Amino acid sequence: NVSSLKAYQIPVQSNSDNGKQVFGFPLQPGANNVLNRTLLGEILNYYTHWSGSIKLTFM
Amino acid sequence: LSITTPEEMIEKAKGETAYLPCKFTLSPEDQGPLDIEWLISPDQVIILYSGDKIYDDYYPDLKGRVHFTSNDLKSGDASINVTNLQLSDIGTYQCKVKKAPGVANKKIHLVV
Amino acid sequence: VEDEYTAAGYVTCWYQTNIVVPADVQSSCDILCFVSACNDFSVRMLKDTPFIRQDTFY
Amino acid sequence: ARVADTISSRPTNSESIPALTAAETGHTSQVVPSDTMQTRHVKNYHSRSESSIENFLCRSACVYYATYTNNSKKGFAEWVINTRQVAQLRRKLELFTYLRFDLELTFVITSAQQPSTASSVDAPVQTHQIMYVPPGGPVPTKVKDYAWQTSTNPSVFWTEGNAPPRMSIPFISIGNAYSCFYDGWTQFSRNGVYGINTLNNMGTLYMRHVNEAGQGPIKSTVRIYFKPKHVKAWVPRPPRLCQYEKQKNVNFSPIGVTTSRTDIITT
Amino acid sequence: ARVADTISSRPTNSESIPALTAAETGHTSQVVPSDTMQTRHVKNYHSRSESSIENFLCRSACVYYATYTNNSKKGFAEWVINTRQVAQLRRKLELFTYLRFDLELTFVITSAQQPSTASSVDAPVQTHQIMYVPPGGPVPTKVKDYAWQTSTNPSVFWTEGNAPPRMSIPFISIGNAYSCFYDGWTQFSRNGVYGINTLNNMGTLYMRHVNEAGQGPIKSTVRIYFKPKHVKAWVPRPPRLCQYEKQKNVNFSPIGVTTSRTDIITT
Amino acid sequence: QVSTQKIHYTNINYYKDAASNSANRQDFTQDPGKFTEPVKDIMVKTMPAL
Amino acid sequence: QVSTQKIHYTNINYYKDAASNSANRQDFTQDPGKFTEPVKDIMVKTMPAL
Amino acid sequence: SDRVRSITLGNSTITTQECANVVVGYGVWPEYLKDNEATAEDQPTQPDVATCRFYTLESVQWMKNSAGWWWKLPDALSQMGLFGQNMQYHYLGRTGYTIHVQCNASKFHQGCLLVVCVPEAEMGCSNLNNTPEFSELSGGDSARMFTDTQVGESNAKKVQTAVWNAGMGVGVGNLTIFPHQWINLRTNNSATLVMPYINSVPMDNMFRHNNLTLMIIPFVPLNYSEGSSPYVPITVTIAPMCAEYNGLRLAS
Amino acid sequence: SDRVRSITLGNSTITTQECANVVVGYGVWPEYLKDNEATAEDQPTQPDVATCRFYTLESVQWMKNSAGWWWKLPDALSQMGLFGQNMQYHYLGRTGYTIHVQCNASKFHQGCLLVVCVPEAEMGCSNLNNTPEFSELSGGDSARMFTDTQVGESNAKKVQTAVWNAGMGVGVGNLTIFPHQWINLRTNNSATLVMPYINSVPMDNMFRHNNLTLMIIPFVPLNYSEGSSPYVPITVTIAPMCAEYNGLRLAS
């Protein structure tokens, strides 16, 4: 899905069993390869230290 | 760059499979390309890892008997599995890792 | 950069209940996810990026 | 310019929900971490100083380097001034659409001896001349010419073994800001090249030796360094992802969004 | 900051004994020589100025020196910045546990000619470039590369025959003080190396020539000099007795407390 | 002429141009409201959005 | 700006940072009481310790 | 008088008939984290009765040919009740200790101990290129002991336990610059120290970093004639003061 | 508006878009133990951030032939983090709960639940002379389920799970006198109750006495046509409010 628009979608289906996982990733906003090329991640890859909190808007 | 134990002694028996570990961590300055060697002195290279592709036909006595173990070599795994140990496998093995600007060694003494 | 001393944990997401759905509706709904900084974000120690290489002049 | 602090909170249970919102309206949410949990009153002493524009852009970077041989005909270097040729600086400029800055040009000139044939060579210290031509002026063709000296174009004379030379250039443009991008042609019939503007022309730079060929050829090399100051930026822009290929246009080859992982839950 | 004086005394005979005490309570005694004998009132004019911290540490010392050949491939010197490699400076730092200082880096660069083969060699003045890379930036591999110039890392350009170059570096750390010692691992499973911290990383230093190989190889040599200023120290520590052996760990070989004498009463 | 640093320091302009001065490095102002909330009707945190 | 030496001398800060100043060399204060007597109950010289 | 003390904390109480004065840190008392110094973004938890009590470690026998012992301080309390359970579920945490060590003999034994509390005690390995492992560096509530002989080179990962170098390559005579007290069987019976939080960061993880070390070294060895009691035990009691935590997670 | 709520506690937050009003106890809010009512002689401990958060139990599938479920309330939280560890080392303890149960279906399913919180729910055994054992009366975070058929006499120690008698020999229609709410898939989605400490003594042990019981009984069964989603789960979340303890001891 990397060379497509499918990389932004999380598939959520009507599951049969309960308590399953949807996704997951570590929170390293300059080191992980999911938060790397975002708009926040291409500002942090000009600096070295960072601080503060992060919002994660879902929809 | 730093290896966990830069020298030890490993004692195994003939016909078994040796497990020579080589693990490391990553200091924040290390940003270059990866490089992993292995040596023997019963100074001949026995395996390589550079440019994401493995080259492993180097020692004639150990032809097709040594392999890497993990699938995640850029996470701190450089262990090799020596299959079918013989009496003539006596010598110090040297795990040379070089991710710039770091370099480390590990002299593994293997006696069966 | 990827360090082990100052790692920041993990973010997961779990089903609480199922996704129920009426008749003649598709099942596989999709979810988007954004990211942003708060009002108290800050940076330091300007360096050069690792994302753009070069080998000649254009 | 300190950052905002954080105020403590109590366990609430009421109708005012700060967490649920709607991102349909194009409004990025302005929540605080004091709304979804219990926090303590933290005195906050960080600073947003190094994230400003005048600390992000006012740093020197190489733009070009050309070599020229003393023992040659037409041995001299011409270079039209533009930012588009290096890539570590160009990506920093295309974050914003309209820029406005002056400039502090600085040159680092080094020399090297070529494999000459003559015996017991010895040369005194050399002299370089860096001529700056505004767009439209008469330009020289050969090195031994009278258009180099007899001109009122602002040049700089430098000899080796000293501090590097430095001149400053103010905001020379016809509009109100340099245009990093120009969607639309330059001819009214809409034919020809696509993104060529006449709003950020600054001129050329002509560099040459001043001495003559004594006994052995000397091949020099000169780097040019920008330094934008007093910078004001406008209308930000998402950063360039694919590799550059040309200096004039913006063309590219397609590539994926990021490097992949094995599975959607793999950490 | 004068020292305390001494007041005269009279021959006493009473119950208040100032000399007998008990060292069990961890309290070093605070007696004066005016309590065990008869002294005179001595005006005392000495000074404790040179025993302060900012007169004990703010002195320049060499940290490293590397050589690099002009006529070579990968001829350049990389060095991660750390105090642990020399021994005359390292012992001065481990007197205290937590330090906090800025830094004044100074380089002394010398050159020497290698035994070349070419005839009638002559080179102009050389140029050196000392690039400073913060921890995480892209580093160069070969000397002829575009990552040297086109970067916003703070480098310094120097030519020979002048004053030595000097740049200043503020307190770059994540904690509140540099940790000279770190008892405990860096991985939460408690495996691997022992005393490796990520609290005093300052970056690397890349040094290379700027000129090209004219006719004869030149082998240079560059020393690096620290100078801590504005220093604040915390939690003192007994001085290191046994010899150092490695730069990362603190390992050693055992040796006695001091050199011996012949008999307990021999003076 | 004399101002504070990041104690004081003294800065004198020498040349009689405007492009000859040093960089300011102390223009500390920001206003993120023209990027986060570029809407017409104002929006409160506590109330629901619709 | 002007202070005494070890007569007076004049010191001007030029750069607009804080890590650019010269070394102080005149922070003359000491307090050895936190190393010699780090105890809770106070201890007099003349009286016996126990 | 001036010889008796009675320190109480929580639901425990340590009393001593014969003891010297108490020595407190570098001159400060362990208080809570002020709001100017904090960096975490959530609210801490303070149990304050469930942790602040005197836990008691194991005892060691003081023989005639003894060498010394050491404990790593936020590791011996890993299994001791509600302190050991709040240390696992959280992520951060600061503490201040109140160390107390007691060893009684009659008016006929002679000897002298040195009780010191060393911050950031890095120890040296046997081989010069390796580093000591976790199982040979500390023990859960069990004292690791020094030796009087240099450890041989054939060991791979073992701590250098030469007592005159105190494990850290430093002269053992200069160890009194740290906060310390002396146990002397002639006039003293119990030593007591109060140690504030000493670290370069305002809060820290507790499973990866042991930021204190209580060392006990006998300078004058134990000696007596025949007919006296031969078994002399030492027993240390530690109580955390003003502890707090942050960052809930799963167990580990 | 009047449909959305957002209750937060500690480091968790439960939000609901469609829910009715909250029902609170018998008219009181769970506060701390006042000094007039106390009887213990020591000082209590109040973690207050380490316990007061929303733990989440297991989920159950609402089939068409379902009967009902029940949980014993200070027993399902025996393994849930710092509440389950402070419950073992102490001896006493009072709590107040904030029960929340959520079950979502579309605009095409029909059905109705009854969510009630019964204090002192003694249940009846299968045989008339025996008493039910512990393993068949409650489960750690697992719902025990009713039946629609009378349990046979051949069992020795099993709970009578006839749903029209609600296990306690009482008419199930009269169960609404306790604090309760209705889940109705037509107009409602989530039910929420706040239960204060209801006991005849001011504090109690927590391993021997389960002083609450959350029952869930579907009156109108789930029904839909073919083509809708057949799997409808229910999930309950409970958070203790204003808890405190006394009497340290060993583990058990």
PDB file of N, CA, C and O in Angstrom, chain D residues 129-140 145-157 167 169 202-206:
ATOM      1  N   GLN D 129      39.916  38.075  -8.661  1.00  0.00           N
ATOM      2  CA  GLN D 129      38.966  39.158  -8.843  1.00  0.00           C
ATOM      3  C   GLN D 129      37.596  38.560  -9.083  1.00  0.00           C
ATOM      4  O   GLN D 129      37.427  37.757 -10.003  1.00  0.00           O
ATOM      5  N   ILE D 130      36.628  38.946  -8.270  1.00  0.00           N
ATOM      6  CA  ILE D 130      35.279  38.407  -8.349  1.00  0.00           C
ATOM      7  C   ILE D 130      34.367  39.551  -8.758  1.00  0.00           C
ATOM      8  O   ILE D 130      34.030  40.413  -7.943  1.00  0.00           O
ATOM      9  N   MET D 131      33.966  39.563 -10.022  1.00  0.00           N
ATOM     10  CA  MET D 131      33.164  40.641 -10.575  1.00  0.00           C
ATOM     11  C   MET D 131      31.697  40.262 -10.537  1.00  0.00           C
ATOM     12  O   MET D 131      31.328  39.140 -10.881  1.00  0.00           O
ATOM     13  N   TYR D 132      30.859  41.202 -10.117  1.00  0.00           N
ATOM     14  CA  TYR D 132      29.424  40.982 -10.012  1.00  0.00           C
ATOM     15  C   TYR D 132      28.718  41.846 -11.041  1.00  0.00           C
ATOM     16  O   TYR D 132      28.844  43.072 -11.012  1.00  0.00           O
ATOM     17  N   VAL D 133      27.972  41.217 -11.933  1.00  0.00           N
ATOM     18  CA  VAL D 133      27.343  41.898 -13.058  1.00  0.00           C
ATOM     19  C   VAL D 133      25.837  41.892 -12.838  1.00  0.00           C
ATOM     20  O   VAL D 133      25.239  40.813 -12.760  1.00  0.00           O
ATOM     21  N   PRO D 134      25.188  43.047 -12.740  1.00  0.00           N
ATOM     22  CA  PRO D 134      23.727  43.090 -12.655  1.00  0.00           C
ATOM     23  C   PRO D 134      23.105  42.648 -13.967  1.00  0.00           C
ATOM     24  O   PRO D 134      23.780  42.673 -15.006  1.00  0.00           O
ATOM     25  N   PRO D 135      21.822  42.226 -13.972  1.00  0.00           N
ATOM     26  CA  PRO D 135      21.257  41.647 -15.198  1.00  0.00           C
ATOM     27  C   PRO D 135      21.055  42.657 -16.312  1.00  0.00           C
ATOM     28  O   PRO D 135      20.133  43.476 -16.280  1.00  0.00           O
ATOM     29  N   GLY D 136      21.924  42.593 -17.313  1.00  0.00           N
ATOM     30  CA  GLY D 136      21.825  43.478 -18.450  1.00  0.00           C
ATOM     31  C   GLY D 136      23.154  44.061 -18.873  1.00  0.00           C
ATOM     32  O   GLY D 136      23.294  44.521 -20.008  1.00  0.00           O
ATOM     33  N   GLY D 137      24.137  44.049 -17.979  1.00  0.00           N
ATOM     34  CA  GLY D 137      25.409  44.677 -18.241  1.00  0.00           C
ATOM     35  C   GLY D 137      26.234  43.928 -19.264  1.00  0.00           C
ATOM     36  O   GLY D 137      25.950  42.776 -19.592  1.00  0.00           O
ATOM     37  N   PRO D 138      27.265  44.575 -19.804  1.00  0.00           N
ATOM     38  CA  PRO D 138      28.146  43.883 -20.750  1.00  0.00           C
ATOM     39  C   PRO D 138      29.053  42.897 -20.035  1.00  0.00           C
ATOM     40  O   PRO D 138      29.656  43.210 -19.008  1.00  0.00           O
ATOM     41  N   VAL D 139      29.143  41.694 -20.586  1.00  0.00           N
ATOM     42  CA  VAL D 139      29.894  40.625 -19.939  1.00  0.00           C
ATOM     43  C   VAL D 139      31.181  40.377 -20.719  1.00  0.00           C
ATOM     44  O   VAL D 139      31.239  40.656 -21.926  1.00  0.00           O
ATOM     45  N   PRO D 140      32.248  39.919 -20.074  1.00  0.00           N
ATOM     46  CA  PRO D 140      33.492  39.660 -20.799  1.00  0.00           C
ATOM     47  C   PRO D 140      33.494  38.281 -21.434  1.00  0.00           C
ATOM     48  O   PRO D 140      32.794  37.364 -21.009  1.00  0.00           O
ATOM     49  N   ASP D 145      41.133  41.131 -21.348  1.00  0.00           N
ATOM     50  CA  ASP D 145      40.208  42.056 -21.978  1.00  0.00           C
ATOM     51  C   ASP D 145      40.098  43.300 -21.114  1.00  0.00           C
ATOM     52  O   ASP D 145      40.374  43.270 -19.914  1.00  0.00           O
ATOM     53  N   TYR D 146      39.697  44.402 -21.738  1.00  0.00           N
ATOM     54  CA  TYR D 146      39.582  45.666 -21.030  1.00  0.00           C
ATOM     55  C   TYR D 146      38.221  45.866 -20.389  1.00  0.00           C
ATOM     56  O   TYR D 146      38.040  46.841 -19.656  1.00  0.00           O
ATOM     57  N   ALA D 147      37.264  44.974 -20.634  1.00  0.00           N
ATOM     58  CA  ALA D 147      35.975  45.083 -19.969  1.00  0.00           C
ATOM     59  C   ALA D 147      36.020  44.623 -18.521  1.00  0.00           C
ATOM     60  O   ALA D 147      35.068  44.884 -17.781  1.00  0.00           O
ATOM     61  N   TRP D 148      37.091  43.946 -18.105  1.00  0.00           N
ATOM     62  CA  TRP D 148      37.218  43.534 -16.713  1.00  0.00           C
ATOM     63  C   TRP D 148      37.503  44.725 -15.814  1.00  0.00           C
ATOM     64  O   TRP D 148      36.804  44.949 -14.822  1.00  0.00           O
ATOM     65  N   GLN D 149      38.536  45.498 -16.140  1.00  0.00           N
ATOM     66  CA  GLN D 149      38.904  46.629 -15.301  1.00  0.00           C
ATOM     67  C   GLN D 149      37.955  47.806 -15.478  1.00  0.00           C
ATOM     68  O   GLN D 149      37.296  48.224 -14.523  1.00  0.00           O
ATOM     69  N   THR D 150      37.857  48.335 -16.696  1.00  0.00           N
ATOM     70  CA  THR D 150      37.201  49.617 -16.948  1.00  0.00           C
ATOM     71  C   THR D 150      35.689  49.447 -16.881  1.00  0.00           C
ATOM     72  O   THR D 150      34.979  49.479 -17.889  1.00  0.00           O
ATOM     73  N   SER D 151      35.186  49.284 -15.663  1.00  0.00           N
ATOM     74  CA  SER D 151      33.758  49.106 -15.453  1.00  0.00           C
ATOM     75  C   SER D 151      33.413  49.546 -14.042  1.00  0.00           C
ATOM     76  O   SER D 151      34.245  49.502 -13.136  1.00  0.00           O
ATOM     77  N   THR D 152      32.164  49.964 -13.872  1.00  0.00           N
ATOM     78  CA  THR D 152      31.652  50.381 -12.579  1.00  0.00           C
ATOM     79  C   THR D 152      30.802  49.310 -11.919  1.00  0.00           C
ATOM     80  O   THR D 152      30.010  49.626 -11.026  1.00  0.00           O
ATOM     81  N   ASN D 153      30.930  48.063 -12.348  1.00  0.00           N
ATOM     82  CA  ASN D 153      30.269  46.966 -11.659  1.00  0.00           C
ATOM     83  C   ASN D 153      31.014  46.670 -10.365  1.00  0.00           C
ATOM     84  O   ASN D 153      32.247  46.711 -10.349  1.00  0.00           O
ATOM     85  N   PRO D 154      30.320  46.384  -9.275  1.00  0.00           N
ATOM     86  CA  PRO D 154      31.013  46.207  -7.994  1.00  0.00           C
ATOM     87  C   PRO D 154      31.758  44.888  -7.894  1.00  0.00           C
ATOM     88  O   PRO D 154      31.150  43.832  -7.710  1.00  0.00           O
ATOM     89  N   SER D 155      33.077  44.939  -7.997  1.00  0.00           N
ATOM     90  CA  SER D 155      33.916  43.758  -7.916  1.00  0.00           C
ATOM     91  C   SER D 155      34.697  43.787  -6.616  1.00  0.00           C
ATOM     92  O   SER D 155      34.724  44.795  -5.910  1.00  0.00           O
ATOM     93  N   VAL D 156      35.349  42.671  -6.300  1.00  0.00           N
ATOM     94  CA  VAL D 156      36.145  42.575  -5.083  1.00  0.00           C
ATOM     95  C   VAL D 156      37.477  41.919  -5.426  1.00  0.00           C
ATOM     96  O   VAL D 156      37.531  40.991  -6.242  1.00  0.00           O
ATOM     97  N   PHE D 157      38.559  42.456  -4.876  1.00  0.00           N
ATOM     98  CA  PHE D 157      39.908  41.993  -5.154  1.00  0.00           C
ATOM     99  C   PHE D 157      40.454  41.302  -3.919  1.00  0.00           C
ATOM    100  O   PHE D 157      40.380  41.850  -2.818  1.00  0.00           O
ATOM    101  N   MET D 167      30.823  40.327   0.740  1.00  0.00           N
ATOM    102  CA  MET D 167      30.043  41.495   0.380  1.00  0.00           C
ATOM    103  C   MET D 167      28.580  41.221   0.679  1.00  0.00           C
ATOM    104  O   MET D 167      28.155  40.070   0.787  1.00  0.00           O
ATOM    105  N   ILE D 169      24.433  42.067  -0.214  1.00  0.00           N
ATOM    106  CA  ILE D 169      23.550  42.427  -1.317  1.00  0.00           C
ATOM    107  C   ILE D 169      22.140  42.633  -0.782  1.00  0.00           C
ATOM    108  O   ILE D 169      21.574  41.713  -0.179  1.00  0.00           O
ATOM    109  N   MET D 202      19.152  37.892 -10.095  1.00  0.00           N
ATOM    110  CA  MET D 202      20.069  38.700  -9.312  1.00  0.00           C
ATOM    111  C   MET D 202      21.357  39.052 -10.039  1.00  0.00           C
ATOM    112  O   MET D 202      22.050  39.976  -9.609  1.00  0.00           O
ATOM    113  N   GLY D 203      21.693  38.357 -11.115  1.00  0.00           N
ATOM    114  CA  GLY D 203      22.880  38.651 -11.888  1.00  0.00           C
ATOM    115  C   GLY D 203      23.858  37.496 -11.875  1.00  0.00           C
ATOM    116  O   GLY D 203      23.602  36.432 -11.316  1.00  0.00           O
ATOM    117  N   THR D 204      24.997  37.725 -12.514  1.00  0.00           N
ATOM    118  CA  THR D 204      26.028  36.711 -12.664  1.00  0.00           C
ATOM    119  C   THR D 204      27.255  37.068 -11.838  1.00  0.00           C
ATOM    120  O   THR D 204      27.372  38.165 -11.295  1.00  0.00           O
ATOM    121  N   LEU D 205      28.185  36.122 -11.760  1.00  0.00           N
ATOM    122  CA  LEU D 205      29.435  36.309 -11.038  1.00  0.00           C
ATOM    123  C   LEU D 205      30.576  35.839 -11.918  1.00  0.00           C
ATOM    124  O   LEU D 205      30.612  34.671 -12.314  1.00  0.00           O
ATOM    125  N   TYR D 206      31.507  36.734 -12.215  1.00  0.00           N
ATOM    126  CA  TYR D 206      32.650  36.430 -13.060  1.00  0.00           C
ATOM    127  C   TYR D 206      33.906  36.451 -12.205  1.00  0.00           C
ATOM    128  O   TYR D 206      34.189  37.456 -11.548  1.00  0.00           O
TER     129      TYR D 206
END
